[PDB]
Design a protein around this nucleic acid. Sequence first.
RNA 1: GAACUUGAGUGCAGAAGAGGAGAGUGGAAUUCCACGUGUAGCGGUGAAAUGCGUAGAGAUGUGGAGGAACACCAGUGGCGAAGGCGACUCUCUGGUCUGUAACUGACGCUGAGGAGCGAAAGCGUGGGGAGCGAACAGGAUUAGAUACCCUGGUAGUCCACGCCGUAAACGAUGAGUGCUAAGUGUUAGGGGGUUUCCGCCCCUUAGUGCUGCAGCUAACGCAUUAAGCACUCCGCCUGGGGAGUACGGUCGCAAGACUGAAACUCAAAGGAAUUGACGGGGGCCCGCACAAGCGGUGGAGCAUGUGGUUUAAUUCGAAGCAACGCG
Lengths: 163, 131, 65
Amino acid sequence: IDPSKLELEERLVTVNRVAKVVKGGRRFRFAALVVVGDKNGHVGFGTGKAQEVPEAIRKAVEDAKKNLIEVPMVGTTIPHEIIGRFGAGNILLKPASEGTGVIAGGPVRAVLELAGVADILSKSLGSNTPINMIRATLQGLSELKRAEDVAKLRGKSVEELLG
Amino acid sequence: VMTDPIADMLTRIRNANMVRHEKLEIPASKLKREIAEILKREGFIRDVEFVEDSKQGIIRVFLKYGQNNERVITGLKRISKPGLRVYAKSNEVPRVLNGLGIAIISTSQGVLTDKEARAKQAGGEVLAYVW
Amino acid sequence: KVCYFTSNGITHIDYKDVDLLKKFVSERGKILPRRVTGTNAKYQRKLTAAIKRARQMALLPYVSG
RNA sequence: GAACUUGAGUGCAGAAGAGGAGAGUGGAAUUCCACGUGUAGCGGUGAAAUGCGUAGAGAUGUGGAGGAACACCAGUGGCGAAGGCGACUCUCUGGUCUGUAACUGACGCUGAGGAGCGAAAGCGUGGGGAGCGAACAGGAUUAGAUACCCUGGUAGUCCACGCCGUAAACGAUGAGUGCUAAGUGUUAGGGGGUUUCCGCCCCUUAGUGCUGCAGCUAACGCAUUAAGCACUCCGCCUGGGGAGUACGGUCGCAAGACUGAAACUCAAAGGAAUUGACGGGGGCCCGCACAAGCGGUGGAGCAUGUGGUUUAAUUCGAAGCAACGCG
């Protein structure tokens, strides 16, 4: 995916001050986690370290732009329920009715709102570590099957699939 | 010992599918054979052969992969188990993956999919989900 | 090395056959290990029983000096 | 209700094994006893001493007594449900594995409660007692040394019967079944391929190791001997202390075992991995670091700074190296 053609918004999920101990004291760095997305079905996340916070955030954006994925979206919701699982991060994502809006936790919300999903239910069922919740969310979103492509794979019409 | 042949057959498919095997051979039974036939009719497997022998027969199932070697069958779950049977009313027959998958219900009309059983307003034992 | 008994088609090792047995004991009388004599696993066990029977019956020494 | 043979089992033909119980037998070594030869120490430690020895020790030769354990073989080798089992022979006896398709035809899996087994210590009765050795005594060490170390040494270790029923009883991994890349050792079989064979190669079961896909895991790692994918049954967990404690009950001769809380108290306890630091851990290297030398200080008189104390004030600052002839 070329991020130049997409109009990508950036959202700063978290900035953790981490420390490497050395003789004399402690080398602090900042680990920024940022999600970016076009709000039209593409979303990605990246992680950047640096000694200053602005530079950390800049490096996260470049990383995120490298790893964009395409989230299948039926109308304003997801095609079907899925449980995004990654390590201990375990996010359930359920399709919702029109006008429900995005009902998700903090980090999960960033991913879904930047992906441009308008109506979706979610619930974090495992660890709330931001990095792993995001990884679980994108793993789950990456497993969503669109009805049209399923029909092609199974050799049927969409009429037969939906029934 | 063997306690759920249906579950065991589903697992053979799941495991073979996971490593993108072309075919697998399942020891046959009337009920397992009916499930296999549904998978073909619904386009989850390529073909199913029934080989006779002195014993109970063998079902050779040919798995189906799309372009880019993509697995058509994403997952299989056993629902009704020997330890806890699951029977559904006609109106409570489950849809699987929001209608993108199927459920196989054993009914007095026969072994049907969820859609087929629903049209007949029939319930019964919910054997498995396939998506 | 190859097993002496499988080569020569020796099915039954016997504790009486002192001259044969003496090829498997050291100068001091220690039973030589299989790693050094190349014997098969199966025949090492049979051979060990023979040497112990021989030592009991004074055909082989326990300790040479 | 009637059939079927794959599961399970039986028959038939083979194979290995420290599987168990009983009864015998053998060689080495330690100790003790007797005797010959023989003389001044032997033993022990970081260094010593206690101890043993001229009453003839230790060393050395011959024979004898007795108890315990079985070098070499010996091998992430074998067998067993686990604990566990290792000299040889015989008696009794359990299980597993391979082939066969002669037979039965689902007869199977798991299994609360229950029963049996269950290292070592320990207990009761009676034997036995070399070595070892809780306790204990003495000699050292030490500030102390109710220890480590040394010289002795009781129970015990051993045997028969009975009791106890606990272990880091561990693979910290319940049992059964099936499915899911390979490579490579090794144990007991079967079949075959060129053969007298040997052997090499190929295949196949069933164990036992290592590496390693997919997959799983927080990570470490597991990976056809799963910690993967499934299904059946059983046991167990719900923050750390209090506590495996109290009460009750069952068991036991006793020691105690099993079952098993709460009040109260903390906001942690914990797993894996990472960065450094440290180690009376290892490796490598360097330095007036040591070593190889030379001349000093610490003693004395005095100069100076500091501390203490005395003063009306004894101005203020500097305090291991890195404050003290320093501002």
